[PDB]
Symmetry: C6
Subunit: 30 residues, 6 copies
């Protein structure tokens, strides 16, 4: 349903955010 | 419903946040 | 209910966070 | 219930995160 | 339940995230 | 169900995010 759909959206965005933050963390080493 | 509306609202900001962090990740390379 | 109330709070905070990250992204371009 | 309790904690933490990100934005100006 | 269990994990993670961002904010002052 | 699955994904992502932010905080000290 709508809630599930949004949660999948939220889950996809958090995966992207995690990836970007991993990238940032790697850059600041360095 | 309200939860659903809030969840759509929640999903949009996280897209903005994801984009900004992509930009930030790009600047820092 | 409490859950809805909390979700509206959560939504508001995420808007503040998104805004701050836009600012941060801008500063780091220079 | 437990879900409601957790969401309140989540809201509280997001307020803290928001405050910190404002401080971070100020520093980078 | 499974949902409640996940929310506690999420709540725990957000506390850690808040803590880390506070440390980051402090470091960026000087 | 799907909601629980998404929340597990969300919980997993926030753990990653928390971890990356610790790395970033450590780096800014340093
Ligand atoms: C509202 C529920 C079910 C999950 C929301 C999780 C969430 C709002 C995480 C935000 C993490 C964040 C924006 C970090 C920014 O550095």
């Amino acid at each position: 349903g709508e809630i599930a759909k949004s949660l999948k959206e939220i889950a996809k965005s958090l995966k992207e955010i995690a990836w970007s933050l991993k990238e940032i963390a790697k850059s600041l080493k360095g």
